[PDB]
Design a protein around this ligand. Structure first.
Ligand SMILES: CCCCCCCCCC(=O)O[C@@H]1[C@@H](C)[C@@]2(O)[C@@H](C=C(CO)C[C@@]3(O)C(=O)C(C)=C[C@@H]23)[C@@H]2C(C)(C)[C@]12OC(=O)CCCCCCCCC
Ligand SMILES: CC(C)CCC[C@@H](C)[C@H]1CC[C@H]2[C@@H]3CC=C4C[C@@H](OC(=O)CCC(=O)O)CC[C@]4(C)[C@H]3CC[C@]12C
Lengths: 600, 105, 60
């Protein structure tokens, strides 16, 4: 009778249902029997009826509910979930809410519909995880994510059942987490996202004054603000960072207060407790600056307190430590250079020391080894809990070890270390503004475009030179010699005296001509062109890249210091902005900004 | 192309073309030669079918086949054109980066 | 009607593509007919919708 029932419900006709009650009573067959349910998914009668209706009025639902109550299977029938990978978990209430039918939502909850049921089927998953619509996996989160204020209002405060706002799905995300998860930078989306977020926050605070809704964290460990920063959602991040609440009852949770005004000058202090931390917990700034592949990484930093905080930190302690570090690094490299220079050529390593000058060389050596081990330890700690610096440190330590063992080879690698030691000194110009943007651009072009160009050139050059070598007739040694000669000719110095043994010299001349033409005219020119266009495309990006580089250097310096030193240098003044519900003072960290307005 | 490069490199300078084969190394060179000729004839057939029903590849194939023919006939000149083929063989390897996005533009 | 081909062997869609006419090519590639009598000749149908997600299958 399953096909007949499905046809009856799909049609929506009331008459066909007559007689089902006595039929079930006589045969004592429940509406959740395997035969009645569709084997493919598990869909029961109610979801099918709700799926296909007219102008929000199916007109069959009450009869189905009455029948199920007659049987006495409402508990297992009204909330019967779907099976299968695609739609697992989905219940009738999810459908009713998805179809924007308040009437049916009320009628469903009135009868005992499970309001906390989770719909974690593969249809409802994040876009990156092979899904279509992620909404928090809850009826309440669904209504909040589909921009339906009335549904959320009724659902939260209903006599029969209440879905508390502070509730977490399998992933741990709460309704605010989902509402940030579906946010997009479009104006239409943000306009309702912010409104619903604020409404829901105020309602939760009103109902429960003790707890805080944004305190909750998901399994990942983030909060709505940190997650919005991580997911690159400027629209809601900017509205949460400057949230101000005029209501006196709910002013405690506000984030931006007015401090004082004199004429056109207005001075307001922002709150940055969660925004900036000293190792107590993860900070928005660290996440936004250090994580990669962020949509609006550069735009997100242009917010009223963020930029001024970076500025104040830079003045307070950023500049001094940077100059100290660069000077010390240069001095250390000079000491290393002197040590390598004065390495005694005579004898074999290690060399005995029996004079004060020997002890001077030893002092330089120990300083260099200390620097190398320090860099190695810093990199290893970073890995456990700067690739070029890692190479420098590992090469230094290996050179010291081979010096201890006894072999000439160490000097080579030791010298190589010195090369790298200066090769990256340019990267310390990063902190400087005028030359730091140029250093960042040089590093960017060097790694991305120069890797491709070099890889393109290597095989071409080696194969073409091998072809020319094969052309000549009087053979690894011959190739080894000729390759040096050919590279020297590529430099523009030398002479092609080796062609005497070759037959058909004309074609060899032509081939060398074309080789030179390609190497100098086309290959070299394209490298020139690429730099010119990239800078033009990033002409505006220059300031963005510079600001990001400045931020990352400042944050690296801040991270390096231990916790208590950070406590000493922490920026912002403790300001008692009000008294909590119990009356005790807040005493919350804040940072002050003042502007000028001639229109207010 | 690597196989072709090795074949050209190990072409015996001594003697005159064709060179008799009486050793396993000779058969290694012969295997490389037949592979190169197969590649050339395949490219030639593809281009000829396109024409009946890639100009640089057409040049590569025609030069390879001509070099093989002149190797069979007996003349030193073939090596020249054979080498020239190898040049073109790599000269257009860059054009296979086309498919890649970053370097294809 | 679009089955007919000229001496060249093309159809209105192929000819619009060959002649570089975006305006009519885009309107012929997404042609949808609401009338039930003449829905067979339509080229873009709606498949299903869930909330803000809409899924339509084109004919190719
Ligand atoms: O130990 C420190 C570490 C932590 C550094 O901070 C050094 C300098 C800075 C800024 O603090 C740059 C770094 O962030 C960096 O990029 C590397 C390779 C190490 C850290 C610092 C000394 C050179 C004194 C030292 O090494
Ligand atoms: C254009 C870019 C992408 C390719 C990099 C060029 C190198 C692959 C070339 C440039 C100079 C060449 C070298 C010139 C001299 C020698 C020594 C030679 O061995 C000898 O010592 C005998 C000759 C001599 O002693 O001068 C072996 C090859 C090598 C390293 C040559 C091999 C290839 C080198 C490093």
């Amino acid at each position: 009778n399953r096909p007949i029932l499905f046809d009856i419900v799909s049609r929506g006709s009331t008459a066909d249902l007559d007689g089902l009650l006595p039929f079930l009573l006589t045969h004592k067959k429940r509406l959740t029997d395997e035969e009645f349910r569709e084997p493919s998914t598990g869909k029961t009668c109610l979801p099918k009826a709700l799926l296909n209706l007219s102008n929000g009025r199916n007109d069959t639902i009450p009869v189905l509910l009455d029948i199920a109550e007659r049987t006495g299977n409402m508990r297992e029938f009204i909330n019967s979930p779907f099976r299968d990978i695609y739609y697992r978990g989905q219940t009738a209430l999810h459908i009713a809410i998805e179809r924007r039918c308040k009437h049916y939502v009320e009628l469903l909850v009135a009868q005992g519909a499970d309001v906390h049921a989770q719909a974690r089927g593969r249809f409802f998953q994040p876009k990156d995880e092979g899904g279509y619509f992620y909404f928090g996996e809850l009826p309440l989160s669904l209504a909040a994510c589909t921009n339906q204020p009335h549904i959320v209002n009724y659902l939260t405060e209903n006599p029969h059942k209440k879905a508390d706002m502070r509730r977490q799905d399998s992933r741990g995300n709460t309704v605010l987490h989902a509402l940030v998860a579906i946010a997009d930078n479009t104006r239409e989306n943000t306009k309702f996202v912010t409104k619903m977020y604020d409404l829901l926050l105020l309602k939760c605070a009103r109902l429960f004054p003790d707890s805080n809704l944004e305190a909750v964290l998901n399994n990942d460990g983030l909060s709505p603000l940190m997650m919005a920063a991580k997911t690159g959602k400027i629209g809601i991040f900017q509205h949460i960072i400057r949230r101000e609440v005029t209501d006196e009852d709910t002013r405690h949770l506000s984030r931006k207060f007015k401090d004082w005004a004199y004429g056109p000058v207005y001075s307001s202090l922002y709150d940055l407790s969660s925004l900036d931390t000293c190792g107590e917990e993860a900070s928005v700034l660290e996440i936004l600056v250090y994580n990669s592949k962020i949509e609006n990484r550069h735009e997100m930093l242009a917010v009223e307190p963020i930029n001024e905080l970076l500025r104040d930190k830079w003045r307070k302690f950023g500049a001094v430590s940077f100059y100290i570090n660069v000077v010390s690094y240069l001095c250390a490299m000079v000491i290393f250079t002197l040590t390598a220079y004065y390495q005694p050529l005579e004898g074999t390593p290690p060399y005995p020391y029996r004079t004060t000058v020997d002890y001077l060389r030893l002092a330089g050596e120990v300083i260099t080894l200390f620097t190398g081990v320090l860099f190695f330890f810093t990199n290893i700690k970073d890995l456990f809990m700067q690739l070029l610096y890692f190479i420098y440190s590992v090469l230094v330590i290996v050179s010291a070890a081979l010096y201890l063992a006894g072999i000439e080879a160490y000097l080579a690698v030791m010298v190589f270390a010195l090369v790298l030691g200066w090769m990256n000194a340019l990267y310390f110009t990063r902190g400087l503004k005028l030359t730091g943007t140029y250093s960042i651009m040089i590093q960017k072009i060097l790694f991305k475009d120069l890797f491709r160009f070099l890889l393109v050139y290597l095989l071409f050059m080696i194969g073409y030179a091998s072809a020319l070598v094969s052309l000549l007739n009087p053979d690894s040694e011959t190739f080894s010699t000729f390759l040096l000669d050919l590279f020297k000719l590529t430099i523009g110095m030398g002479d092609l005296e080796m062609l005497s043994s070759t037959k058909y010299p004309v074609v060899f001349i032509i081939l060398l001509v074309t080789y030179i033409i390609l190497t100098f005219v086309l290959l070299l020119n394209m490298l020139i062109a690429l730099m010119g266009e990239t800078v033009g495309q990033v002409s505006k990006e220059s300031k963005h890249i510079w600001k990001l580089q400045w931020a990352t250097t400042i944050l690296d310096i801040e991270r390096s210091f231990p916790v208590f030193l950070r406590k000493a240098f922490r920026s912002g003044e403790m300001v008692t902005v009000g008294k909590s519900s119990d009356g005790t003072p807040d005493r919350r960290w804040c940072f002050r900004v003042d502007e000028v307005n001639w229109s207010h």
